Design a protein around this ligand. Structure first.
Ligand SMILES: Nc1ccc(-c2ncno2)cc1
Ligand SMILES: [Zn+2]
Length: 140
């Protein structure tokens, strides 16, 4: 589990979004596994605006942060999940690391701020849904 809180926005994994998230829907992309909902309370997170390919992510199944190298956001085939059919995910970044289903929502960060959230795992890879292109998260 996990979310990003920036301005009046909450960013979550689309497959973990709550009924309240859906009732307060701002934007969702199935192909990205992202949903953004509106919040009453001001969020304190900063979104990275950069092309970093290194950062640190939180891994809840290890209670650890890991430093990783990751690929630039791309269209990647992702195997079966209990929350998706075997499908193409877009804006996905892969690193070598540990990810289990409950690690989704873990934040990947660089010096510039939040890069993305854990979205995919298995076969010793961790996949992160990028948010850096969503420039609209940093205004109204
Ligand atoms: N192989 C490494 C080493 C360090 C980092 C890192 N430090 C801070 N943010 O990333 C990433 C990958
Ligand atoms: Zn960066």
């Amino acid at each position: 589990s996990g979310a990003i809180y920036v301005g009046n926005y909450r960013v979550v994994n689309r497959h973990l979004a709550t009924h309240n998230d859906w009732a307060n829907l701002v934007w969702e992309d199935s192909s990205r596994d992202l949903l953004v909902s509106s919040t009453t309370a001001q969020g304190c997170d900063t979104i990275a605006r950069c092309d970093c390919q290194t950062g640190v992510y939180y891994c809840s199944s290890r209670r650890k942060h890991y430093p990783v190298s990751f690929s630039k956001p791309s269209l990647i085939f992702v195997e079966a999940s209990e929350y998706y059919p075997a499908r193409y995910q877009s804006h996905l970044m892969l690193a070598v690391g540990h990810s289990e289903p409950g690690d989704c929502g873990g934040i990947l960060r660089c010096q510039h701020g939040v890069v993305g959230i854990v979205s995919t795992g298995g076969n010793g890879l961790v996949g992160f849904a990028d948010v850096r292109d969503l420039l609209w998260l940093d205004e109204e």
